[PDB]
Amino acid sequence: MDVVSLDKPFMYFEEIDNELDYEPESANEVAKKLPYQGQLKLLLGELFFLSKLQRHGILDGATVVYIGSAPGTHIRYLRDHFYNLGVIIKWMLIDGRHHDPILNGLRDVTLVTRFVDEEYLRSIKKQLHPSKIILISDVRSPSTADLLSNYALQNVMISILNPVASSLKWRCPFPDQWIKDFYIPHGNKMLQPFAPSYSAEMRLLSIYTGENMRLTRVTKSDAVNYEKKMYYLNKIVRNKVVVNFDYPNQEYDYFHMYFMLRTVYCNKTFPTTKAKVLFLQQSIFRFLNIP
Amino acid sequence: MDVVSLDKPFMYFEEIDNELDYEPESANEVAKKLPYQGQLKLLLGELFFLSKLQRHGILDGATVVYIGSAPGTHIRYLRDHFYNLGVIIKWMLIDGRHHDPILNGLRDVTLVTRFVDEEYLRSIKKQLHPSKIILISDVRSPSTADLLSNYALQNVMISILNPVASSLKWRCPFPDQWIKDFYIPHGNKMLQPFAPSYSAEMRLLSIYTGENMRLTRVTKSDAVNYEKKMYYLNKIVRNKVVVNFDYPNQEYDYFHMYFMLRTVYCNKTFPTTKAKVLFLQQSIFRFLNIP
Ligand SMILES: C[n+]1cn([C@@H]2O[C@H](COP(=O)(O)OP(=O)(O)O)[C@@H](O)[C@H]2O)c2nc(N)[nH]c(=O)c21
Ligand SMILES: C[n+]1cn([C@@H]2O[C@H](COP(=O)(O)OP(=O)(O)O)[C@@H](O)[C@H]2O)c2nc(N)[nH]c(=O)c21
Numbered sequence: 001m002d003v004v005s006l007d008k009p010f011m012y013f014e015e016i017d018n019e020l021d022y023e024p025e026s027a028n029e030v031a032k033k034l035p036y037q038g039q040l041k042l043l044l045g046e047l048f049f050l051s052k053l054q055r056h057g058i059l060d061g062a063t064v065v066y067i068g069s070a071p072g073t074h075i076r077y078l079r080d081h082f083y084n085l086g087v088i089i090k091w092m093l094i095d096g097r098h099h100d101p102i103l104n105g106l107r108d109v110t111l112v113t114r115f116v117d118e119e120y121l122r123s124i125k126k127q128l129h130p131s132k133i134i135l136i137s138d139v140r141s142p143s144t145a146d147l148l149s150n151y152a153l154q155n156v157m158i159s160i161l162n163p164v165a166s167s168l169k170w171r172c173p174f175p176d177q178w179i180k181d182f183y184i185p186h187g188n189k190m191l192q193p194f195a196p197s198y199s200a201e202m203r204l205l206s207i208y209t210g211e212n213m214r215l216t217r218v219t220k221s222d223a224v225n226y227e228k229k230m231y232y233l234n235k236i237v238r239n240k241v242v243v244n245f246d247y248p249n250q251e252y253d254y255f256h257m258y259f260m261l262r263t264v265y266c267n268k269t270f271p272t273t274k275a276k277v278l279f280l281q282q283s284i285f286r287f288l289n290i291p
Numbered sequence: 292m293d294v295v296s297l298d299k300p301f302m303y304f305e306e307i308d309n310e311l312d313y314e315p316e317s318a319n320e321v322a323k324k325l326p327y328q329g330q331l332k333l334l335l336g337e338l339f340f341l342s343k344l345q346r347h348g349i350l351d352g353a354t355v356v357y358i359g360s361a362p363g364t365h366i367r368y369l370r371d372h373f374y375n376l377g378v379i380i381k382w383m384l385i386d387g388r389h390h391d392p393i394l395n396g397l398r399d400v401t402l403v404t405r406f407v408d409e410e411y412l413r414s415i416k417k418q419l420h421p422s423k424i425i426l427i428s429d430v431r432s433p434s435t436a437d438l439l440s441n442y443a444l445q446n447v448m449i450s451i452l453n454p455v456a457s458s459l460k461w462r463c464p465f466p467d468q469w470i471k472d473f474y475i476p477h478g479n480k481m482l483q484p485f486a487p488s489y490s491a492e493m494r495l496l497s498i499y500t501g502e503n504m505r506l507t508r509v510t511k512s513d514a515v516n517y518e519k520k521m522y523y524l525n526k527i528v529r530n531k532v533v534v535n536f537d538y539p540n541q542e543y544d545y546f547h548m549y550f551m552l553r554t555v556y557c558n559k560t561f562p563t564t565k566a567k568v569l570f571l572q573q574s575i576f577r578f579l580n581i582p
């Protein structure tokens with residue numbers, strides 16, 4: 001068995017302290033071990049992001065515009081969580097694909113079947129006005145050309161919507177498929193527990209202060225680094241059994257999930273953080289029908 | 292006579308401490324009082340900007356890419372000034388129009404007759420590599436639609452060229468011709484002595500640290516402010532005779548020119564700042580054939 005003792009898990013990209021030469025043979029390995037693992041991945045990341053905004057007092061009264069939301073099964077859980085906590089939020093879920101029927105019939109959630117273009121963003125901005133917007137993007141076209149186009153759209157989302165915070169899908173193009181250097185918004189590179197086994201995807205979390213928008217250039221050298229740090233995380237770290245983690249499941253992803261869940265607010269008062277987390281996890285797994 | 296005593300002149304937009312309702316009748320007033328006033332305007336601004344970079348030690352060894360450079364008569368003066376100071380610089384002047392023949396025959400200056408598009412910027416970037424680039428832009432198409440397009444090109448100039456510093460033409464669209472909010476790079480809004488009488492144009496000066504690029508949103512409310520602050524500067528300030536300014540000419544623009552010129556480096560040693568400035572001004576006016 002692959003045992004180790006860890007203090008904390010890598011929460012952000014920059015914390016990764018090692019790297020590995022990417023082995024293309026990893027692409028043939030089992031990408032997922034849990035049913036609905038993709039909804040779990042998104043649920044934890046967005047719960048983490050949104051709880052932060054609550055902590056900063058910028059969630060209540062906001063309209064969450066989620067682009068690339070369908071099917072969105074896990075979004076029903078997020079909505080119920082903040083709804084039950086007393087936070088007042090409107091959700092606007094936009095995707096060309098259809099949403100899970102569990103999202104219908106809620107006055108606080110608007111479902112839209114539209115593929116967003118810069119022009120449509122303008123109309124929704126004019127229509128949301130004057131509400132504060134929180135953007136969450138998970139749009140999907142992939143080639144490096146598809147990616148750049150997605151990233152280019154995400155940047156236009158921020159410029160037109162002008163949100164107070166944003167969570168953006170972020171996976172750097174692979175060095176061997178480089179096309180050109182580009183810019184992404186500045187934010188924390190949140191790592192994702194339960195991401196596919198060898199995924200190099202993370203989420204870019206940003207909070208917009210002032211009227212400024214800071215970007216950051218991404219080059220091929222950055223692409224090489226992303227590939228090597230993520231490959232090391234996936235191949236090595238995520239395959240560790242954190243034995244000094246007394247918890248029903250000690251696998252790295254549960255250890256990592258624990259640190260995100262410990263930041264979540266609950267109505268119920270618990271005697272320990274461990275009890276709150278077990279509760280949140282049981283709750284999340286039951287909702288998603290994960291054994 | 293319109294007399295006043297001033298400590299310093301307004302060097303940057305933010306320093307303007309008052310505003311006036313724009314009077315459209317000002318558009319019919321004499322825009323210029325000196326011959327070649329436009330070359331003088333550009334010369335002082337770019338001398339100011341470039342001397343700053345020298346002060347920060349980022350000029351020597353750079354390639355100055357000037358887009359929208361023609362005719363560029365005043366650029367010959369700039370080139371001679373730094374050339375004679377020992378600073379090593381390559382100049383690349385690009386415009387679809389032809390340059391002043393005085394710019395020919397200098398091994399350190401390349402003249403290009405091309406209307407730049409994003410694609411061309413890419414080729415010149417690949418070709419300048421690996422030199423450090425200093426961008427100066429004075430491109431001209433104007434409607435608010437022409438402006439936005441110009442500004443959009445200037446931002447692509449910075450993203451592709453990735454310069455260490457930049458000077459950009461900046462005039463906010465008028466509030467009554469607003470089209471949409473947009474972003475410009477963050478920089479100092481340098482005011483321009485000898486700008487046309489009622490011009491709302493300034494230059495955006497930026498130095499790029501790290502791999503970050505910070506932008507700033509410009510709205511119609513900003514457009515109203517720009518109009519009112521600039522109108523106050525033009526109608527009131529620029530029409531003042533600074534009597535506590537002992538100098539051959541006491542008009543505001545000369546008082547303002549004095550503060551830019553006092554920052555310029557010379558080979559010759561002077562007993563007073565006043566002597567250096569008079570020298571630089573005499574020199575500049577003689578070069579431009581201004582009486
Ligand atoms: C993690 N990774 C994946 N690939 C390629 O990406 C393909 C799809 O796997 P994926 O990377 O999970 O796709 P996604 O990012 O769209 O979700 C694989 O079949 C590999 O060919 C990769 N190719 C390179 N060069 N480097 C990597 O780090 C890498
Ligand atoms: C300074 N100013 C100029 N204009 C208009 O701009 C026209 C051209 O004058 P300009 O503003 O000097 O042109 P430019 O910025 O392209 O160099 C004038 O005939 C006016 O109609 C202006 N129009 C408005 N609404 N507000 C202003 O502050 C203003």
Ligand SMILES: Nc1ncnc2c1ncn2[C@@H]1O[C@H](CSCC[C@H](N)C(=O)O)[C@@H](O)[C@H]1O
Nearest residue numbers: 068069070071072095097115116138139140
């Ligand atoms: N322009 C656009 N507008 C809306 N959604 C977009 C988009 N282009 C692609 N997408 C969507 O991006 C999605 C990526 S899959 C998203 C999964 C979703 N976030 C979840 O909660 O279940 C797809 O449903 C696709 O239709």
Ligand SMILES: Nc1ncnc2c1ncn2[C@@H]1O[C@H](CSCC[C@H](N)C(=O)O)[C@@H](O)[C@H]1O
Nearest residue numbers: 359360361362363386388406407429430431
């Ligand atoms: N894409 C482009 N590439 C090059 N120059 C451009 C441009 N579009 C417009 N311009 C140029 O922008 C200039 C504006 S006038 C510039 C005056 C000049 N800076 C001086 O030193 O004399 C015009 O000469 C025009 O041809």
